[PDB]
Each structure stands twice: as structure tokens, then as C-alpha cells.
Amino acid sequence: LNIMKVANYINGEFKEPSTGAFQVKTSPVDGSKIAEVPRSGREDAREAIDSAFEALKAWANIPAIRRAEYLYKMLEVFRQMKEDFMKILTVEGGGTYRKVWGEVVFTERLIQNAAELARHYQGRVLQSDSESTISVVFKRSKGVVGVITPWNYPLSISMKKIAHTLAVGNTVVYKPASDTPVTGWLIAQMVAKAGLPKGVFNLVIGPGPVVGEEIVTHKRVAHVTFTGESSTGREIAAKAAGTLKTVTLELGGSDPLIILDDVDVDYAARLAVFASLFHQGQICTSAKRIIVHKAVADKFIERYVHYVKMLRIDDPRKDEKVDLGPLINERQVALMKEFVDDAVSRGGRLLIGGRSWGNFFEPAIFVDVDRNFRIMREEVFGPVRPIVVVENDDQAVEVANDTDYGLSGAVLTNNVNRAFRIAEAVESGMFHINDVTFLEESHVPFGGIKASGVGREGGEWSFHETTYDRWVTVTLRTRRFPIPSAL
Template identity: 40%
Template structure:
């Protein structure tokens, strides 16, 4: 769920600040900014509290997470009201975030004990069967999470849940554009009877840098350029990172697709949250036989959309005028280069950071709307003559987050999916991989490193692995020590070599 970076913003944030709605300009609330110099102290407090949190064990932590899930459900209306106020979202878009967190919590409550259980490993060779081999998962004390503004609830906590389940403490740095809901999420954690292993650091670049410098693992969501800077700073202390970065997700519509389904999926996937989703549908390649039908269906669907903040609207404002400017630049450049805007295409007059849903045709890869991440409510559609052309164009990108393929022939769609250079592909759907917490969500190329979720790996990613090798018996102990004769050592080495070569010799025949 990528968003424009906050780590890179140099503006000083001191004292307290006022947050305004990007849709109306009304005051959404007040926030007290964190002094970057205080971050080491905050991290130290988390590190101290983490010891007891880890000692509770997986079952003990699951009980706390369960209480937190119940709290989120009980306070959903309050959270969504504030979410709309500070982001300008529609009520429809705001309603998605808390249920996603509850779903993730429900999954890890039942999974964490298995995830944290040590793995036993078999002996690699018969003569090592005298050893018991086990891999233990030890939580990293403090996980720093630098979250973006596009989903202030979901992006703030979807990774934190896995880290907390693992037994880590979490130092969360929300976007300075949307800091208010994070305060409510923290209050809910403490009201659930949880220990103080979740803390906030509010601010921009200096605070983000301090979080990186004082954490044992970093989860960053943002732009590819800023992700590289996060990784570079983390490398100073060899701090591991997981990065979910930019996307320019393609959709491919084959000639045998259900065109109405594909068109409605494209519109929802492009316009949901005003296009401010990492896995938004940002470009569409349609096979020539169904191109005209698809475009007509898309335009009909878009013309029914209502844009506005709060209740009664399909999608809301963009986060601020700088994001609107990017969207407008992509559209304006495309039209100047020969594209046509069948809907929208121009920022409306009046208050708020709104941009109308814009369908673009006659586009190609010379245009920024097809190659750069827009992160706005646009839908550029390109006609292609073959599946091979569609795949080639879909892969012609620096990004590789996710994609979608539409066809009534599922096996054919899977064959196309496995030619796409990205971390996830949805067949006859869009964005649904976000709900699949049992599978990894990660990007290729400049779309990221590492993955979210992934079953037990969504917990284990926040852990260090520790291998413990214990004896089953004293037989064979010390067989290769210096106190044995050279002849005995030579015999053992000869035996080890012969046993190790047995399988390669069989396979090589």
C-alpha cells in the first residue's frame, strides 16, 4: 500500500500541529510532534518492556491481541470518523481498514503459536543422526514501522500485528500528514490491557531517521526512491529491512474475458481510495477484439461514480494538492501527446484536493501515465494485438508489485500470470491478494524487498533464527577432536566423504 514518502520531507515539526481535512480544510485535530532527540529514550523503554512481553509466550500474547481485536470492533465508528476527517476519504473507502486489521489479528491469534514453535530438522547424513537439530525463533526487541498516509489505520498496524505477535515491541512512525488515527490505535492497545510495547514517534524526516537508528528491524512502506534511502541508512548498523514500495500495476484483458466483470474490476481497482493504493490498477492492456466493448463498459461505470468525502460517495479526495498535481501532470502530458480523456481530465473548481475519475485512451509507453506511479484516480487503457504484446508491455516497467489477468479460461490466465514479473497476480479480480494473509505480499524490481504476511513467515520475519544442536547420545562425541590419532581422523574423514557422495553419485548417473 505504497504512498508518497514522509521520510524525505525536510520540513521541521516541533511542538504541536494542526491537521486539516484535504477535502474541506476543516480542522481534523491536533498532534504533538516528537522531538527526534527523544526517540532513543522511547526505544529504550520499549526494549525494557519487550522482555516481559516475550516471556508471556505465544498463547499469552494471543490473548492480548484478541482483546485488541474486540476493542477495534467496538470503536470502529470512532476510528472511521477520524479517518475520514484527516484523509478526506469516502465512507466506503474508510470502512475497509478496521475490518482488515481485525481479519489479520484473527489469523495471527490462531497462527502465532505454530509460527513461534521451534522447527526440528532432520540429520543431513546418517552419521549425524546422533544429533537433535532445532531452529528457534527469537523476536527482535524493537521493530520500527514507518507508515504512509494512504491507509493510516491498515498500514500502521498490519505489520505491527505480526511483530507484536512474535514478541517484539513496535515503534510506529505514522505519516505526518495523517497522525491522528495512530493516536487512537495506541489508546486502544493500552485500553485492551496490553503492556507498553507499542509507542509512537510523530514527525517527519528527522524522526524517521531516529526510528531507523534505534530499531532492530525496519518495515517501511513508501516510494521506491525513499525506500532506497531507508535501506541505506539502516545499512549503517546492518539493520534488516522489509520494504513495500511503488507500483504501476497492470491489468491484462484477454479476448475471452467476461468484459463487464473486467471493466467493473478495472474501475474499482483504479478509483478505490482515489487511486491511492499501492496495488491500484494503473494501466490496462486489452486485446483488440474486446477493446471497444471494454472501453464503453468502463466509461459507463465511471460516469456513475460520485466523488466526495464521507457518506454517500464512492471515493474521496487525494491527500493534498501535491498529489493532485502529479495526477494532473500525468493526464495533461498524455493528452498533449495524443491521448484522449473520455471522462474527467481536469481538476474541478472549488475547495478540496479532488481529481475526477479519468479514463484515458490512445495511450502508449512514451507517456508518464503509463510508466510512472500516478497514485490518483486515472485509468489509462491501451489496445494490444496479442497476448505476447500484453505481457511484454506489462513487464516493461521498473515496478513489479502485483497484476491481474482476466479470462474465462483459468488455466490460460494462470499461464499468462506466470509470465508477469511481479509479486502477486489476481485472476478475474483485483487487489484481492491483500486479503490473503496466508500468502506473501511482496514486490519485485523497485517495488520492494521482503514481503508482508505469508502465513507463519509474517511472524517469523520479525525474528532472529537460532539453531540449537543437542546430542541424542554420547556415542560419536569428540570423534574429530585433536586428541584422537591422525589415523582415526583420516578414517572419519574418508567415511564422511563416502557417505556425502552417495546421493550425488546416484543422481549423476
């Protein structure tokens, strides 16, 4: 960064936006300058899309093993760049050492996963109901894929989409979140060093409503995979319809963490603190609504607050043991203030926390909450967390399902019957028994239901999203036809 300018990566070349316009990226930690970055426009997006389109047929037609080879090369370059990624995830994104280390380790597994699976994505040989007929189904890549990503886990979320989409023979136009441009540029550095053919991967840094919208509305883009807010997702889905492009949407969550009366209460509290407050609660599968059985509610709350008190908030560059960094910007702090203020004025009891300074915001924990609190009705993408007390499992489920979202969820209990009945009844795309709500592996179907979006990503589920089935037959006998009937 001290020797290179941040730039777009289009058709194998690093370069400025056509207008030359730029923005200054600052750190959420202390407001210091990180870099000037492109402020691209529609012409830049169009150039990337055309580059991706022109590269597509050669990239889709080579054998899978050759695409796997490029991905293994990418993996090798990533391993060399780990420290650079960690550094930027911390200073640009505000992530602690432990968070960004976790993100980089997972990203390494994601890239490897995509490389591993490329050669093995199979179609099907079918039984034909007709005689003398061969009937099979091939897998084909969709084409040019737009990749639009958020700021909270910008590396791992970007690379899950990019690596798997590339593995099955799509080409890519990537637009990172405006708050995390340097992470996207480092990804382009990685891809360039790995030597992928020009145009196969393109980076365009610029405003969502401009560059993103051009990607979503362009006729040469076949598919858009998007992670962000539910409202943005709805807009993208609607704009995508104009050219009938398919979409993958992961739109956040208000995941329930349900704690029953038979748990190890102290472990439950330790687990709950991690699940609800890691990365300052800025995780789509954060445990955003904690739901506790009344028989252990008092000890659980005391214990949860006890460990929350221990959380160390600081400049995440200071050392490896900082627990929480800042939120990404001042808008998030203002929003978390609204959440706290709304809860207090509604009669909610603030057990602990509530202070903020600059972009830093302390955990703010509430009890005595009801369903009309904003922190029960909206995704709270920050460290404000309600605890709800319930009398039985039926109530646990009612509260857990009383949300527009449906991403993940978890139950803690040692009873196999209660665990399975609750897992079945909770309306979520993912569910975890005796673990955190944000469990994620590189090759499992990650995604939600209801307002949390559509589709699944991870391993072959990513492949399902960015390929199509192609039924092909061969008929080995001639036959007579019904018209003209006179014959």
C-alpha cells in the same frame, strides 16, 4: 478529540513531545481543522526506542499464549472503537464510507489473525548426519521493530505490521504518516485500553526525515518494516545497513490489468472501474495500467467510460453512497495535473474527466498512449489511468512487464491455458485470475518484486520477517579430535 489532546504514547504514558512543538492537522475534504498534533524530534524517538528495548526481554519471554491474550483484548477494544476509526479515516484521510468500512473490517480480521497465529509458529526437528546428535531449530523474535507507514490505508497497513510483529514477541516503535497522525493516535488509544505492558508499544508522531530516520539508524532497533514510496524505501534500506538491521519494504506498484477477448465485456468493465479507481486510485495494488485485447477494445472502452461517468465525487461525510473522496493534499492534485498535462501534450486522447477543485480530482482516462508517457513509466498514485490496446497475449505480457514495478497484477479470461501462461509470465509478487489487482487477505504473503520492494507481510509471512532461526544441538557422545595429532 473534543475532550483529549493528541499526544505521543511512550512507555505506557500519553505525553507531549519534549520540545512541545506541534502542528495543526487539517481535513483534505474542506481544509477545516481536525486537531493539533505533536511535531516530535530525535529525543522523542530515542526515548520510545529505549522504552521498547527495556520492555523487550519480558515481552519476548512470556509464553505465546499470553501475547495472544493481549491481542484478543486489543481486538475487543478495536470492536468498541470501530465508529471512531471510520470517522477519522474519512475526515483525516478523505476515504468514503465504503472504503473506510472495508478498512475497519479488514483491520479487525488482521488483529484477530495475529492473535490466532501466535501460539502456532513452529521451528523444526532435523535429521542429524552425525550419530548421537539432537538437532533442532527454534524461532526467536528479532527485538525492537520500527514500524513506518503511509497515509492511504493508514489503519489496516499499520495494524497488519503492528499486530503480527507484537504477536511473535517483538516490541514496537510506530511512526505514522504525517498526513494521518490521528489514526496513529487512535491506535495507541486502542493499545493502551488493552493494557499491554509499558514500552511494548510506542507511538511517536513527527516528520519522516527526523523521527523516521532516528528509528532507521538507531543501534537498538533490530528491524524496520516500511510501506511508502520506492525512493524513500531505497533511502531507508541504505541507512539500515549501518547497524545491519533487516527491513521489510512494500513500495507501491504499477499493476497491470489484462483483459482478453473472451471475457464478459460488461463485467470486465465493472471490475476494471473498481480495481483502477477505488480510493481515488490511491492504492499500491490499484489497477494502474489497463491492457485490453483489440478484439474487445472498442466495446470495453465504451463500457468502462460509461461506468466511470456514473462515479459520484463528493464530501465523503455526506452519505454512505459517495464513490470518491478527495486526494490527501494539494501536492497530489498538482502531481495528477502534471500526469494529465504530460499525456495530453504527448498526443494521448483524454476520453473523460480532468477537472479538479481543492483536493478533489476527477478520474482522467486516456487511450492512444505509448511507453514514454509519464503515466506508463511512473506509479500514478491517483485517478489517472491509461488504457493500452494490444494485438495478442505476447503483447499483453510485454506491456505488462514494461515497468520498473512488480507488486500485483490480474488477467480476465475464461481460457485456462491463457490465464495460466500470462500469470506465469507477468513479473509480479502477486497475481489474480479473474479478480481485482488489489485482492488481499490477512494471512497471505503480500509483497512485490523489482522496484515494489522486498519481503512479505500477512500472517506467518510477517512472522518470518520479524523472527530468526536458531539452530541448537545436543551431542550425547564424546569423541576424539584431530588435533593434537600426536594423541
